[PDB]
Design a protein around this ligand. Sequence first.
Ligand SMILES: NC(=O)c1[nH]nc([C@@H]2O[C@H](COP(=O)(O)O)[C@@H](O)[C@H]2O)c1O
Ligand SMILES: NC(=O)c1[nH]nc([C@@H]2O[C@H](COP(=O)(O)O)[C@@H](O)[C@H]2O)c1O
Lengths: 257, 257
Amino acid sequence: KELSFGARAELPRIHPVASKLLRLMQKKETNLCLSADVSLARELLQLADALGPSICMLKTHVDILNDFTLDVMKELITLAKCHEFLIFEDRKFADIGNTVKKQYEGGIFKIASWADLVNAHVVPGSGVVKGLQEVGLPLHRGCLLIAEMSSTGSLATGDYTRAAVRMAEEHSEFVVGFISGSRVSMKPEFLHLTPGVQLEAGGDNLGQQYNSPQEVIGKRGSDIIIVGRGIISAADRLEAAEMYRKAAWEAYLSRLG
Amino acid sequence: KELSFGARAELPRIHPVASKLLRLMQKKETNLCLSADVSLARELLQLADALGPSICMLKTHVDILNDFTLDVMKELITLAKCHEFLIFEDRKFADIGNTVKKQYEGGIFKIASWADLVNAHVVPGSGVVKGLQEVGLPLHRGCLLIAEMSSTGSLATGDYTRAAVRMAEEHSEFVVGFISGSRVSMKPEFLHLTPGVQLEAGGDNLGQQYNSPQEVIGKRGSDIIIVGRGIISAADRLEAAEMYRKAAWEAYLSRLG
Ligand SMILES: NC(=O)c1[nH]nc([C@@H]2O[C@H](COP(=O)(O)O)[C@@H](O)[C@H]2O)c1O
Ligand SMILES: NC(=O)c1[nH]nc([C@@H]2O[C@H](COP(=O)(O)O)[C@@H](O)[C@H]2O)c1O
């Protein structure tokens, strides 16, 4: 039988980052992750402040910010703390373990210093997770494994998906869930976050495909929707975020009973 | 029957970036790509200058440079032009097409402005290539697809590898070859570049596994070796680069007949 987000936050094997997330999802009645796909720091921060109460998570691509500085990420943290959401840097680490460790901790971005969550592809084998965890464990961070992809021609299917689930369930000290289209693990300790979400049917011109919040949270059993253009391209981004929040939240409630 | 690098440079379907690379490989008698895995710009540039005559390519991870600026990449270009080698940013693009387009052109790194070559994982489907090509084609660049990985537990095997080959062979206006452990395409227009290379047997503590230049270039039929620590950790990096260059070049000559 299905547990609420609040009860899942208490599970024996829950990761502290997962528990923090699940608690604020329950408190705020939001399972929406804003994909803050903008190139300006000022727009990122204005969106984070205005939409903060509507979201459980803000997903970044800091490598697309034209004016990235670590001070921008300090300001983002201030907002994340005020409004209570996690920061997820969507870096898709996908190299050998020795390399990703440095990409996570170092360089200009110093991702591990400000990101609560990051994600990784499983294609390199479990060394990708072991390399990240060398940095992420001492910094009390979590990681999401990409088990499925929303794009046309995705190879993250079948045995590849199963390998991602196995990898997560064997690195549960650091891996807190999946990026996936559907529930892929039967262990309620793991989060499922689903991108490729819009209210209307369609896609983009570069292989992105959309499903609705009701479809992915209800029928497909995911936990959280990740929404970029469905919100960002709207004239009123706050009203769009509220539309997506209500859709995902109701879908969850109805699945729960 | 096997063609020399110089003859491959003249093939009807050759990409201009591949032809430039093959020409300089033949001229300089090198099929060594230095993996310049350092965190200091000064060390990067000192290696590029000293080892430039020994290498056909210098592979970067600019997201590990602690002091990246675009002026560092301008100085790297000066050296690449002087010594005649290509710059390969090992970014492993691995997102939906719409996202990778921005990660390639924009942000702080502006990768497309200075990298002759980049690479991509094929897991998202061919939209990853189509997104990159919408920046890379107008900038006259090339891309390599990751068809296999050197690390323990790699999922880039079987039908996944075949899908990478199909994707390359269908985007030949932009994709110039592979990162792989072995020959994966039987079309000589495509380059094969192989990482996980050191003279001695072994590996690292995060899943990297090594094979020798003779094994990779001779028996496995690859074109170019990519070497990081085997060179970078040596006391005399120039002597190490020469050892690797001679090994890979003579393996090529012997396979050619
Ligand atoms: N793993 C996946 O299946 C996957 N699909 N999309 C994304 C990311 O999620 C966002 C989707 O954006 P929008 O289409 O505008 O809603 C975008 O940042 C993209 O990079 C992702 O990680
Ligand atoms: N199979 C693959 O695709 C693959 N294996 N290694 C690398 C990259 O090549 C380099 C290997 O480094 P070193 O072990 O020191 O010789 C390093 O930068 C790593 O990120 C890579 O792209």
